[PDB]
Design a protein around this ligand. Sequence first.
Ligand SMILES: Nc1ncnc2c1ncn2[C@@H]1O[C@H](CSCC[C@H](N)C(=O)O)[C@@H](O)[C@H]1O
Ligand SMILES: Nc1ncnc2c1ncn2[C@@H]1O[C@H](CSCC[C@H](N)C(=O)O)[C@@H](O)[C@H]1O
Lengths: 297, 297
Amino acid sequence: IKKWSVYFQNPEFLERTRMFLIQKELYPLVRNWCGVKDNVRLLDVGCGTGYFTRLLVSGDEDVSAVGIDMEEPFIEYAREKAEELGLPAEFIIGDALALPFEDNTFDIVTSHTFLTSVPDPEKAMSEMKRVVKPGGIISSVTAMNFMPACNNEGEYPEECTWVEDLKKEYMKIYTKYFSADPLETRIKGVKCSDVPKFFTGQGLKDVSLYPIGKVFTLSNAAVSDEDKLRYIELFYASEIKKLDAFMELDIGITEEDAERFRSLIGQKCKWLRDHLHDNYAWEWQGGANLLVTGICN
Amino acid sequence: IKKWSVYFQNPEFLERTRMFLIQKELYPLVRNWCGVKDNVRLLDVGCGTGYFTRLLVSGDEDVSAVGIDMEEPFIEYAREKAEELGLPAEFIIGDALALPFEDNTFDIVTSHTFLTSVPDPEKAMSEMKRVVKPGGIISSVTAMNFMPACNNEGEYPEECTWVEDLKKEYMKIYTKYFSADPLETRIKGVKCSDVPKFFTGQGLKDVSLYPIGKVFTLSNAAVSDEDKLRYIELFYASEIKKLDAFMELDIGITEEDAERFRSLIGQKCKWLRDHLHDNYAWEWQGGANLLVTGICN
Ligand SMILES: Nc1ncnc2c1ncn2[C@@H]1O[C@H](CSCC[C@H](N)C(=O)O)[C@@H](O)[C@H]1O
Ligand SMILES: Nc1ncnc2c1ncn2[C@@H]1O[C@H](CSCC[C@H](N)C(=O)O)[C@@H](O)[C@H]1O
């Protein structure tokens, strides 16, 4: 099995794919539903690059957070991110199955797209229950489906010659990635449909569900330029680093192929940058994540 | 083609299936995104029983609304509903393709799960553009998928003998309904994935997308008893009225079958009522709807 933070999802990939999951305007609601509130200290388990960690501590409330993850690269990045934004969040390398804390340390315990992944969700939940204070809220956000509920590849202007080639190269190189790094190891946890049942089954009380819609497109007028430009940077960087990591291994990608793929990714990004205000391609994707909370005794 | 409000979706069916689409807590956000604001008068096109109409005028803002629909039963019900709740909404029988109003009557024009349905969405949109004031917001909410993104039939206690029989009878009677009333006539409009493209394609500007998550389950601790009890009533009534309408036609349902189906539906409802506080079946379903707005010139 290949190192998660290098070959499967690099730090930039996590940042680019999480950025648009939850509208800015939903943050106070999501904070409230997870039990964020004055003088709350929270733990975010498998925090990756700290996306959800940041979201929860980004309000006006007097809160602090610890994020824990197995991947050194994720923790490094999370620290850099939090430090940059001045946020009260600590990031720590460690194991979900073996939390380096005493019982009843945290008011709130959460995880984001994590219970889906762990080989042993019962034990992880057992840890979350141990470390939360009596009567505190444990929350999980998980994908409702691995497929998007709706999807359009978009229609780019006819001038754009990179569109067909890149589509072709992308699912050629990516099928090669799926060989060398199979997905089935990463999705050993609680099935999407089973999470609510899992919560009451682990003894949690007042089990509550809240859907959280998600949408992606650079054509969206309600998304800031800054966010679009930040996404484009992260997309470029995430694709190039993933490719390079696989080259430095061999998996069946010629150097000509790689330079082609680089060139095309570069052309897409250049087009997206140049058409920041008038991108009407509607390459778009949506669906919903599911928030589940329960109280521990 | 069978009368929509009788054979396809009766007023109670619309109320039961819309009730849980949008969390109460999202109402101010959804109002804002559609351009609801003081001294706004709005039109809701194909308003059905007036679900979305009610949602938009239910805030503190000084707003009023007209709902328009082809179905007399929907309009009747909408009136009864609005009158009961004291809401500033008028409901009118009429045609989306032929709006009984002058140009520039409304500040805002909206529709909910409608652009998906109309045989001629271009003309409907043309009407919406005509009737909205210059620079006003046209909005549409549509399903992201006809399937739910996630799903669990649930695990009812072993004592419940109605569970297996009803599953069996439901998709037996319903396959008979799909024969006598085929679905394909009702879904002649804009494909889910095409709505954003449709908006810019119809000349609308600053086209904006907002996902709206949805979830259903009577096991949810965050849903009020009152809402659960109201859902159960509507479910009972919607199923019985649909069945009766089809009996009064012949479609291949014996009277024994009907009385069986009645009995079972009744037993499910009795169980749901009796287990209002301790339903841990997790019969649940979720996904997201998509809100699209654009400005008219
Ligand atoms: N046993 C374990 N202990 C700690 N972290 C783990 C773990 N197993 C998996 N992880 C981490 O779980 C994460 C799943 S996905 C990334 C999750 C992050 N919350 C986000 O949405 O951005 C990965 O970061 C992975 O490194
Ligand atoms: N040409 C037309 N003019 C007016 N209403 C129409 C129409 N074609 C379809 N409708 C109505 O469009 C609706 C679609 S579904 C019900 C929509 C309602 N907004 C809700 O979500 O509860 C039906 O009520 C149907 O009667």
